[PDB]
Design an enzyme around this catalytic site. Sequence first.
Site, short mmCIF file in Angstrom:
data_model
loop_
_atom_site.label_atom_id
_atom_site.label_comp_id
_atom_site.label_asym_id
_atom_site.label_seq_id
_atom_site.Cartn_x
_atom_site.Cartn_y
_atom_site.Cartn_z
N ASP A 45 -4.30 -7.27 7.46
CA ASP A 45 -4.35 -5.88 7.92
C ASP A 45 -3.55 -5.66 9.19
N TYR A 50 0.18 -1.62 15.93
CA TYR A 50 -0.19 -2.93 16.46
C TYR A 50 0.98 -3.65 17.11
N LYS A 79 -0.17 0.93 8.21
CA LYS A 79 -0.80 2.22 8.45
C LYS A 79 0.18 3.17 9.10
N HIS A 112 -3.60 6.15 9.49
CA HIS A 112 -4.37 5.39 10.48
C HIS A 112 -5.54 6.21 11.03
N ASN A 162 -10.50 6.06 9.36
CA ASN A 162 -11.20 6.88 10.36
C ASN A 162 -11.47 8.32 9.92
N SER A 212 -14.14 -3.77 13.11
CA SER A 212 -15.07 -4.09 14.19
C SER A 212 -16.37 -4.61 13.59
N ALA A 213 -16.25 -5.27 12.44
CA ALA A 213 -17.40 -5.87 11.75
C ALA A 213 -18.10 -6.93 12.60
N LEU A 214 -17.38 -7.50 13.56
CA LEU A 214 -17.93 -8.51 14.45
C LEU A 214 -18.22 -7.93 15.84
N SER A 266 -9.45 -12.80 14.29
CA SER A 266 -9.58 -13.93 15.19
C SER A 266 -8.22 -14.56 15.42
N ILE A 272 -11.11 -18.62 12.80
CA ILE A 272 -10.42 -18.18 11.59
C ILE A 272 -10.91 -18.97 10.39
N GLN A 274 -13.68 -20.70 10.20
CA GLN A 274 -15.10 -20.45 10.04
C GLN A 274 -15.32 -19.20 9.19
N1 LIG Z 1 -8.27 1.50 11.49
C1 LIG Z 1 -8.64 1.34 12.78
O1 LIG Z 1 -8.63 2.28 13.55
C2 LIG Z 1 -9.03 0.00 13.27
C3 LIG Z 1 -9.75 -0.13 14.47
C4 LIG Z 1 -10.10 -1.40 14.88
C5 LIG Z 1 -9.73 -2.48 14.09
N2 LIG Z 1 -9.05 -2.33 12.97
C6 LIG Z 1 -8.65 -3.52 12.20
O2 LIG Z 1 -9.78 -4.42 12.01
C7 LIG Z 1 -9.49 -5.70 12.63
C8 LIG Z 1 -10.78 -6.31 13.21
O3 LIG Z 1 -11.56 -5.35 13.92
P1 LIG Z 1 -11.55 -5.71 15.49
O4 LIG Z 1 -10.11 -5.77 16.05
O5 LIG Z 1 -12.25 -4.56 16.25
O6 LIG Z 1 -12.13 -7.17 15.87
P2 LIG Z 1 -13.43 -7.82 15.16
O7 LIG Z 1 -13.15 -8.19 13.62
O8 LIG Z 1 -14.64 -6.99 15.29
O9 LIG Z 1 -13.58 -9.24 15.90
C9 LIG Z 1 -13.92 -9.03 17.28
C10 LIG Z 1 -13.89 -10.38 17.99
O10 LIG Z 1 -14.65 -11.32 17.22
C11 LIG Z 1 -14.19 -12.63 17.58
N3 LIG Z 1 -14.50 -13.52 16.46
C12 LIG Z 1 -13.87 -13.60 15.25
N4 LIG Z 1 -14.46 -14.49 14.50
C13 LIG Z 1 -15.52 -15.01 15.18
C14 LIG Z 1 -16.50 -15.98 14.90
N5 LIG Z 1 -16.53 -16.62 13.67
N6 LIG Z 1 -17.41 -16.25 15.83
C15 LIG Z 1 -17.40 -15.64 17.00
N7 LIG Z 1 -16.50 -14.73 17.31
C16 LIG Z 1 -15.55 -14.39 16.44
C17 LIG Z 1 -12.66 -12.50 17.86
O11 LIG Z 1 -12.35 -13.20 19.08
P3 LIG Z 1 -11.24 -14.37 18.85
O12 LIG Z 1 -9.91 -13.79 18.56
O13 LIG Z 1 -11.18 -15.19 20.23
O14 LIG Z 1 -11.68 -15.36 17.66
C18 LIG Z 1 -12.46 -10.95 17.99
O15 LIG Z 1 -11.79 -10.56 19.19
C19 LIG Z 1 -8.45 -5.38 13.72
O16 LIG Z 1 -7.70 -6.54 14.06
C20 LIG Z 1 -7.59 -4.35 12.97
O17 LIG Z 1 -6.73 -5.05 12.06
C21 LIG Z 1 -8.70 -1.14 12.55
O1 LIG Z 2 -0.74 3.90 23.12
C1 LIG Z 2 -1.07 2.77 22.80
O2 LIG Z 2 -0.24 1.77 23.17
C2 LIG Z 2 -2.22 2.55 22.07
C3 LIG Z 2 -2.48 1.31 21.60
C4 LIG Z 2 -3.59 1.10 20.87
C5 LIG Z 2 -4.42 2.12 20.60
C6 LIG Z 2 -4.21 3.38 21.04
N1 LIG Z 2 -5.11 4.23 20.66
C7 LIG Z 2 -5.69 4.68 19.61
C8 LIG Z 2 -5.39 4.22 18.38
C9 LIG Z 2 -5.95 4.70 17.26
C10 LIG Z 2 -6.88 5.68 17.27
N2 LIG Z 2 -7.28 6.05 16.13
O3 LIG Z 2 -7.97 7.12 15.79
O4 LIG Z 2 -7.01 5.38 15.02
C11 LIG Z 2 -7.21 6.17 18.50
C12 LIG Z 2 -8.13 7.16 18.61
C13 LIG Z 2 -8.51 7.69 19.78
C14 LIG Z 2 -7.95 7.22 20.90
C15 LIG Z 2 -7.03 6.23 20.82
C16 LIG Z 2 -6.63 5.68 19.64
C17 LIG Z 2 -3.08 3.55 21.77
O1 LIG Z 3 -6.48 0.01 14.67
C1 LIG Z 3 -6.86 -0.70 15.76
O2 LIG Z 3 -7.00 -1.90 15.63
C2 LIG Z 3 -7.13 -0.11 16.98
C3 LIG Z 3 -6.82 -0.77 18.12
C4 LIG Z 3 -7.14 -0.22 19.30
C5 LIG Z 3 -7.76 0.98 19.35
C6 LIG Z 3 -8.09 1.68 18.24
N1 LIG Z 3 -8.73 2.78 18.47
C7 LIG Z 3 -9.51 3.65 17.91
C8 LIG Z 3 -9.60 3.77 16.57
C9 LIG Z 3 -10.38 4.69 15.98
C10 LIG Z 3 -11.14 5.57 16.67
N2 LIG Z 3 -11.78 6.42 15.98
O3 LIG Z 3 -12.04 7.66 16.28
O4 LIG Z 3 -12.31 6.20 14.80
C11 LIG Z 3 -11.07 5.47 18.02
C12 LIG Z 3 -11.79 6.30 18.82
C13 LIG Z 3 -11.77 6.25 20.16
C14 LIG Z 3 -10.99 5.34 20.75
C15 LIG Z 3 -10.26 4.51 19.99
C16 LIG Z 3 -10.27 4.53 18.63
C17 LIG Z 3 -7.75 1.10 17.06
#
Ligand SMILES: NC(=O)c1ccc[n+]([C@@H]2O[C@H](COP(=O)([O-])OP(=O)(O)OC[C@H]3O[C@@H](n4cnc5c(N)ncnc54)[C@H](OP(=O)(O)O)[C@@H]3O)[C@@H](O)[C@H]2O)c1
Ligand SMILES: O=C(O)c1cccc(Nc2ccc([N+](=O)[O-])c3ccccc23)c1
Ligand SMILES: O=C(O)c1cccc(Nc2ccc([N+](=O)[O-])c3ccccc23)c1
Length: 315
Positions: A45, A50, A79, A112, A162, A212-214, A266, A272, A274
């Site tokens: 993903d 990113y 995305k 996105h 989102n 953000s499952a973790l 991770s 990873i 694990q």
């Molecule tokens: N669509 C969106 O707006 C959006 C927003 C957020 C995320 N995402 C996507 O979803 C992915 C994951 O969500 P996330 O970035 O918020 O992070 P996450 O999957 O919730 O993981 C959070 C933290 O968990 C730690 N971790 C991983 N495996 C572990 C384990 N087995 N035991 C203990 N800790 C562990 C990692 O630290 P370490 O790296 O040190 O292992 C990581 O920083 C992102 O990378 C992105 O691709 C999408």
């Molecule tokens: O500018 C950067 O370098 C930068 C980098 C990473 C994330 C953001 N911010 C955001 C990304 C995605 C969403 N989102 O809805 O998916 C956001 C929603 C609200 C606020 C910030 C968001 C900005």
């Molecule tokens: O894609 C990433 O990994 C990624 C990375 C960094 C930030 C975000 N940010 C956000 C995503 C989605 C929402 N959201 O409204 O759902 C957010 C809301 C407030 C601030 C940040 C947000 C996403």
Amino acid sequence: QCVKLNDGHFMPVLGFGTYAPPEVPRSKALEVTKLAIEAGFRHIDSAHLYNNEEQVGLAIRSKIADGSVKREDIFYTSKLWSTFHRPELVRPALENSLKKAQLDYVDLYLIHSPMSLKPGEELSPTDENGKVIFDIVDLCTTWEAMEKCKDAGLAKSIGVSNFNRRQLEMILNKPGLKYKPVCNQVECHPYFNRSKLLDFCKSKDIVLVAYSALGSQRDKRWVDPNSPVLLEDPVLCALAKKHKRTPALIALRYQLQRGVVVLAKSYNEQRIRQNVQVFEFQLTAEDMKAIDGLDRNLHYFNSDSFASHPNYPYS
Ligand SMILES: NC(=O)c1ccc[n+]([C@@H]2O[C@H](COP(=O)([O-])OP(=O)(O)OC[C@H]3O[C@@H](n4cnc5c(N)ncnc54)[C@H](OP(=O)(O)O)[C@@H]3O)[C@@H](O)[C@H]2O)c1
Ligand SMILES: O=C(O)c1cccc(Nc2ccc([N+](=O)[O-])c3ccccc23)c1
Ligand SMILES: O=C(O)c1cccc(Nc2ccc([N+](=O)[O-])c3ccccc23)c1
């Protein structure tokens, strides 16, 4: 272990999250993506946001060349970033992602975020007062452009991220809709389990993909440092002891057994490796209900500014 999307294609139920904060050298994304593929991840993903598509694409290229996997074995997600919502920007955006990653197609392309931003060079353009500049775009027109990307063969499947129920319905009810989103990628974990949205998605044959499952990376830019640490939850930790796994594995397995596709980021080789162990054990139905009880309607990501965006997903 795949789920069949509503357009016929298949998505691996476990995905590798690739976002890392800017302070992490870009070389790491290359290195850890190779490790993830080596460990068994096939769903990867990424996103224009990113700033790593080049590195993720190279990791994939590398693993195909040494014979570890074929392109068709990899499920790659990109995305559409919010500054590219205007329909005429969608295809060029995708083509740029494809050029970056040196790929011919993405397996999945998502909007996105529904929170449209002013077209521009910067990811987050700000005005003279330093506020990020919003844009008004009919997301149905963005979706139409997305449908064209799937017909152009540049994206095997298309989905959203989102979106809330309302926003999803605005697409599903669009006059002359050609393709339903195959999925909605949203924040989902035991403190925000999205059960109602999950039910809706299921009724429409749309996959809910959990991020953000973790418990998130707890980046200070968006996450209150005083928010509870998900993986320190007593119930999750007690379940980890019972099954002799980790709280992280409890969190990932929870999603799998709810019929949710789960991401896990991770940048650590051992974590990873694990994480792929999620397929090695089952939670009991009673374990599942216990975790359902943890919901706190808590989204880790917060933004005072975007809370005022007309398309802010959390009402
Ligand atoms: N669509 C969106 O707006 C959006 C927003 C957020 C995320 N995402 C996507 O979803 C992915 C994951 O969500 P996330 O970035 O918020 O992070 P996450 O999957 O919730 O993981 C959070 C933290 O968990 C730690 N971790 C991983 N495996 C572990 C384990 N087995 N035991 C203990 N800790 C562990 C990692 O630290 P370490 O790296 O040190 O292992 C990581 O920083 C992102 O990378 C992105 O691709 C999408
Ligand atoms: O500018 C950067 O370098 C930068 C980098 C990473 C994330 C953001 N911010 C955001 C990304 C995605 C969403 N989102 O809805 O998916 C956001 C929603 C609200 C606020 C910030 C968001 C900005
Ligand atoms: O894609 C990433 O990994 C990624 C990375 C960094 C930030 C975000 N940010 C956000 C995503 C989605 C929402 N959201 O409204 O759902 C957010 C809301 C407030 C601030 C940040 C947000 C996403």
